[PDB]
């Protein structure tokens, strides 16, 4: 409860969304800092989790979205690219895809958690899919632990798809 209200306001949201943008930058800086990694894995992952949890509920999702989640995600440019394009390469793919799965879960959760239909949320999510299309398509086939991460990402897109106006349905 409680928190949603308090926390909302403040603080957090603003800061956390801005920090999404910077998350993308932070995954690169990731290589360097593998070391300073220890610090941050304990924190960055925790941040994604905090974001995902807020999204799971109606009021929380609203606050995240109000904070301009889609915008920060566009700014991070995490999605608007191809991961394969480019350490042992399978490790980097696992890592990048890993970031994609959590952010994608955050987006799907925010979408559904409002009224995904006529609501504004549906429109925003559809824009998300179309703008970052072909990644969704590209994700659909291949393998490894990397596959496992890929598989989860694929599911996440599928949930985003049906949850919205069927991304397919929209693309009549």
């Amino acid at each position: 409860q409680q928190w949603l209200l308090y926390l909302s306001n403040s603080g957090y949201l603003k800061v956390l969304v801005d920090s999404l943008v910077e998350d993308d930058r932070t995954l690169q800086s990731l290589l360097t800092p593998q070391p300073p990694l220890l610090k941050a894995l304990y924190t960055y992952e925790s941040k994604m989790a905090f974001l995902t949890r807020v999204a799971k509920i109606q009021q929380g999702a609203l606050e995240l979205l109000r904070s301009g989640v889609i915008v920060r995600l566009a700014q991070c440019q995490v999605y608007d690219m191809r991961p394969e394009t480019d350490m042992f390469i399978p490790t980097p793919v696992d890592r990048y895809r890993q970031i994609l799965l959590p952010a994608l879960q955050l987006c799907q959760v925010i979408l559904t958690s409002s009224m995904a239909q006529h609501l504004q949320a549906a429109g925003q999510v559809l824009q998300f899919l179309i703008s970052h299309s072909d990644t969704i398509q590209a994700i659909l086939r291949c393998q490894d632990v990397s596959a496992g991460s890929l598989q989860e990402l694929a599911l996440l897109t599928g949930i985003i798809s049906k949850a919205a106006l069927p991304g397919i349905l929209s693309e009549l």
């Binding site: 995490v78 999605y79 179309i130 970052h132 299309s133 072909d134 969704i136 398509q137 991304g167 397919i168």
Partner: peptide, 14 residues
């Protein structure tokens, strides 16, 4: 057509 359309929607990033 569908393959391409879906590909396009996803490709660019906001």
């Amino acid at each position: 057509v569908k393959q391409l359309r879906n590909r396009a929607d996803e490709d660019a990033r906001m």
